């Protein structure tokens, strides 16, 4: 939780004052979840990049079996157990520190991969591959990814995404891909607006004045922050143009 | 009812005794409702080869609006209008005998275009197109489509498709086809299987006897049966590789 150095700690500390670390909701967490026919008390599932865990627990309240979250941050994963055992699930739910680039789950073992606003760490079609190899055939990925909405847009929001993340598609493109990468799309969907706005930028907004200011004079602190509403104005005046949507994968075979 | 002659008239006399006319659920038509955000009391919808109306139905229970649901078969128009009469739902939902191709509604004048198993009449990419000019910016089209599950498949599905409905795709094909149009493809999901047994081919096959029966030495009804079952048979073989999928799709600009 500190072990990181104080330049990562930050940032962590941050997003441990807040709801989301990127867009989503419970509504849409459950909705995915909708999509998935295969789960019993005997399933393994992982939740890659789960940061503090809120949608791990979303999860565990709704389906069967075991539940592994894996995480780069010692201090969300310190944040996810203690909210586990808050909600007496720590017997079937259980957080690690882990690389997803790096697991060790064994081969065509897992029934259900979650991963969400996380893939893009790795990369959308290098995480399609490689995690394929440890979910069960028939088995299930569901990832949440941005996207653009249209074939054409404005340079400002083209060029801003560049920059973030490359990998940011059209949805037909990342669609595409899922069935390259051997599955069958069995369901994508866009998430509604209130998964930037009521669920993760305002939330966040409301942070930032006391953090700021316990935190005061910190470079990176204050830095972070300007990102945040720059990242939170390009989206108010590009909306129109892109966003997330959830991607439920199919193993095929 | 019997004004397109016998020989039509038999086969929609099948369909009057049926549950459905192609794969879909009480509960996939609410799924695909769910993701319909723009509905009000002042809402004009379409259901477009509506058939007897069955999902329209659902719809009027589900949703504000005025609905009216355009078939070529005065038959199944006869069955929609007394339907929505038994459930006093006639003064928002209207029955009219139409025809896809040939449309009059005002343009830009409708919030949602629904259509479950049915495009395939006049064509995806061409019912993309031309519908999109009766939607309102922002509006919706809802249909349901057949699809392929993955980029190989057995020759003997591929060729029954091919002489059946040649527009069957890949659904990364059918996403790409809806952003050329000019939609964004909000959400685009696959049929279960239990839209193809237990609400289709099941209840198909159940009044098979009795109407064989009914209209005995009659080739044409000996001839659908026969077709009915060589339909089903291939699904039970090679569902592995194909099915139906719903897309939802808003109006862009």
Redesign the interface.
Known sequence: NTILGFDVNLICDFFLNTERQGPGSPEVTL?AL??I?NLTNKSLIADLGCGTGGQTMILAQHVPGKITGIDFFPGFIERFNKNAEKLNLQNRVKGIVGSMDDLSFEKDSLDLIWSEGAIYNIGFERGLKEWRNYLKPGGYLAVSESVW???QRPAEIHDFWMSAYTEID???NK??Q???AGY???????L?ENCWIEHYFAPQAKAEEIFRRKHAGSRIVEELITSNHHEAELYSKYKAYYGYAFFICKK?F
Chains 1, 2 share one sequence.
């Not at 069958?184 to 866009?190: L, S």
């Open positions: 909705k909708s999509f026919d909405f249209t074939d059209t949805v037909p669609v595409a899922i069935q390259k069958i799309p069995v369901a994508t969907f866009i509604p095929g």
